[PDB]
Design a protein around this ligand. Structure first.
Ligand SMILES: [As]
Ligand code: NA
Ligand code: NA
Ligand code: NA
Lengths: 90, 101
């Protein structure tokens, strides 16, 4: 049962060049993901703005933080991705 | 694919009523529906449903054919498949080595 309000918010989180780039970079970087500083470099964007965009994707569920002790890597949430693909094509 | 066409596609789908119309059309492949039937099923006035179909049509996510009184719409499933292949492209450093099925 997928909340259409959640699907909307995920598509809205994606419908921005910069958020789409972050997301697609994190898909390509599965399953280890990236520190937010490396995302910002791949984007040519200030690290602070990237942290905001990331929080927008994270609130929508499309990106999760993989934490090992204190060390945080952002990852695409592939389960939620696969569910989105199914919602739109199945 | 142009990135601007991709964002436009996501924008068209990020709309509750447009998403409901498009999922209905996906469900009704391959025959599609005339717009009046789409509005009647959703219990909405035709003027708003037609508008939202147009938006999906500009985005390329629906195809349209004349049939008198209304227009028959279909989901353009090759375009939607293309959108999801773009979102997943190069998964796992181009290997595609993770659960995508
Ligand atoms: As993968
Ligand atoms: Na991109
Ligand atoms: Na990742
Ligand atoms: Na259809």
């Amino acid at each position: 049962l997928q909340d259409p309000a959640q699907i909307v918010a995920r598509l809205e989180a994606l419908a921005s060049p910069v958020r789409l780039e972050i997301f697609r970079l994190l898909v390509e970087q599965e399953p280890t993901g990236l520190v937010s500083g490396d995302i910002a470099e791949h984007l040519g964007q200030p690290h602070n703005g990237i942290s905001f965009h990331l929080k927008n994707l994270q609130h929508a569920g499309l990106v999760t933080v993989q934490r090992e002790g204190r060390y945080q890597r952002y990852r695409a949430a592939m389960p939620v991705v696969r569910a989105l693909v199914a919602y739109l094509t199945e």
